[PDB]
Amino acid sequence: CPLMVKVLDAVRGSPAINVAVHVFRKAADDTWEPFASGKTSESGELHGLTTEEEFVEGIYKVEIDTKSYWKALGISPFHEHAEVVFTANDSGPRRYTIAALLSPYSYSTTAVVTN
Amino acid sequence: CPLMVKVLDAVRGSPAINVAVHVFRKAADDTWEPFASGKTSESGELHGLTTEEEFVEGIYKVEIDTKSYWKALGISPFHEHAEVVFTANDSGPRRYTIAALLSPYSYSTTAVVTNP
Amino acid sequence: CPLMVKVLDAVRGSPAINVAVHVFRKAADDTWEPFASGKTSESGELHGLTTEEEFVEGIYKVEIDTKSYWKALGISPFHEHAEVVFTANDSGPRRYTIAALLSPYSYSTTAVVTNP
Amino acid sequence: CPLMVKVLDAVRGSPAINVAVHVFRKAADDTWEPFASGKTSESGELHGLTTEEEFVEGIYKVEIDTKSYWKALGISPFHEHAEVVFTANDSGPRRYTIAALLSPYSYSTTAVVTN
Ligand SMILES: O=C(O)CON=C1c2cc(Br)ccc2-c2ccc(Br)cc21
Numbered sequence: 174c175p176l177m178v179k180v181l182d183a184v185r186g187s188p189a190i191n192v193a194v195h196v197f198r199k200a201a202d203d204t205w206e207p208f209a210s211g212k213t214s215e216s217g218e219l220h221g222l223t224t225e226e227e228f229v230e231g232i233y234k235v236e237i238d239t240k241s242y243w244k245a246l247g248i249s250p251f252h253e254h255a256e257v258v259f260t261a262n263d264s265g266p267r268r269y270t271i272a273a274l275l276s277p278y279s280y281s282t283t284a285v286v287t288n
Numbered sequence: 289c290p291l292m293v294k295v296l297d298a299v300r301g302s303p304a305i306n307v308a309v310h311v312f313r314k315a316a317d318d319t320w321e322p323f324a325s326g327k328t329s330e331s332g333e334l335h336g337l338t339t340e341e342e343f344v345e346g347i348y349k350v351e352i353d354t355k356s357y358w359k360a361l362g363i364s365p366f367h368e369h370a371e372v373v374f375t376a377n378d379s380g381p382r383r384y385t386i387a388a389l390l391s392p393y394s395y396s397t398t399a400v401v402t403n404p
Numbered sequence: 405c406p407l408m409v410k411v412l413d414a415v416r417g418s419p420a421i422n423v424a425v426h427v428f429r430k431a432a433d434d435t436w437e438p439f440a441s442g443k444t445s446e447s448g449e450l451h452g453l454t455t456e457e458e459f460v461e462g463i464y465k466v467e468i469d470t471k472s473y474w475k476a477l478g479i480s481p482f483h484e485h486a487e488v489v490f491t492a493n494d495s496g497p498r499r500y501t502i503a504a505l506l507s508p509y510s511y512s513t514t515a516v517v518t519n520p
Numbered sequence: 521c522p523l524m525v526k527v528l529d530a531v532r533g534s535p536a537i538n539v540a541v542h543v544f545r546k547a548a549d550d551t552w553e554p555f556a557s558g559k560t561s562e563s564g565e566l567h568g569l570t571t572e573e574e575f576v577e578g579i580y581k582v583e584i585d586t587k588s589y590w591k592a593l594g595i596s597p598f599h600e601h602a603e604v605v606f607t608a609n610d611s612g613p614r615r616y617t618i619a620a621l622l623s624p625y626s627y628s629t630t631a632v633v634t635n
Contacts (some may be wrong), residue, residue, distance in 0.1 A: 186509030255373035278417030282395035284366040301625030393533030482631040487603035512628035
């Protein structure tokens with residue numbers, strides 16, 4: 174599992190559950206091509222997005238659909254979604270974990286890259 | 289200004305200076321149209337991107353070119369940019385300050401919204 | 405000012421207003437002595453805590469009373485405060501801006517340090 | 521394991537390894553009494569700090585010794601240490617995870633409280 178996404182709710186101090194996540198890969202014509210997607214689990218995590226074979230070097234975008242998450246909680250948010258855009262590199266460690274910490278008017282995102 | 293972008297460097301404890309910022313607005317055909325752009329000042333701030341007249345209701349994307357910033361300091365960072373996508377002025381005109389705090393493998397983006 | 409504290413609310417996208425801030429300085433006997441205190445303004449900022457004369461080298465603690473802030477908004481938060489502990493002026497006088505961004509179960513604290 | 525601490529390095533995109541962590545509990549005379557301590561593992565985590573029996577309601581402080589971490593990396597940091605002060609509550613979920621994301625001149629800390 175070379176790509177995992179983890180989402181936390183900073184308002185409730187809890188995993189952000191049932192958050193839609195869409196991954197895209199940049200195509201040769203500079204458009205974003207759908208690559209993988211899912212919803213975060215009860216632990217705020219999304220695994221099984223891709224395989225080692227398919228996750229080749231390239232530019233990827235992870236969209237986390239934060240607005241719909243906050244709307245479900247009755248909380249008015251700022252962002253439409255959190256975006257994380259990066260180049261996958263074979264030189265570095267083999268596992269990427271994209272973490273996101275969400276508040277209504279702020280988010281932070283961190284990449285933890287390990288072997 | 290109705291729209292101001294501020295960028296800070298969490299490694300150096302400084303403003304992030306001369307960072308390129310591109311603003312786009314979503315068109316009726318769902319494409320991202322260019323809206324405004326500039327570079328952060330010595331204070332890490334970018335003012336004068338738009339006017340209250342031109343900054344109508346819509347979905348806007350602020351793209352902060354963080355990779356180029358880090359590379360110039362000798363650092364190879366994780367992200368290509370920091371993106372900030374939001375609906376603006378849907379409840380009438382507001383003033384928006386979009387801040388980003390940058391580290392090589394992490395960033396945070398925050399908005400402060402004030403009613404004139 | 406050589407020391408400025410800024411506090412923002414990540415739930416509302418606003419300054420955090422009227423937040424109590426206590427500054428302490430570590431004494432020779434390793435105790436925390438009171439140094440300055442105040443409350444954030446309508447802009448979420450607290451200026452005028454100290455002077456360049458009084459703000460000597462030392463270890464300082466800035467305690468931001470976040471629990472009381474959240475409780476007044478009807479929220480029961482996780483943290484009692486946000487604490488910010490740092491050595492100041494060890495390489496000569498510097499200007500320090502300490503910011504805190506608050507959510508009920510999370511906060512971030514950042515420093516921007518500039519040489520006069 | 522009712523209390524866990526997890527520390528990440530935002531500069532290197534990696535778990536923050538071998539970081540000293542000291543936990544204190546507030547005594548009746550308002551002093552901080554040493555309660556538990558350890559160093560983060562290769563995964564940036566510290567488990568086994570306390571037990572369900574000993575972790576009673578009260579005010580606790582978790583100090584994360586960030587300055588020594590950065591000094592080891594040759595990076596000049598702002599903070600002496602990251603502090604996290606909170607009241608343990610029996611009404612809520614039974615597990616506290618204190619997470620910290622570290623940069624030289626900034627840190628963020630989040631509590632994830634789950635069952
Ligand atoms: O990283 C943190 O802990 C919070 O940082 N966010 C900041 C900030 C930090 C500092 Br230091 C100075 C000004 C601002 C600011 C000014 C405007 C807006 Br919007 C946000 C911020």
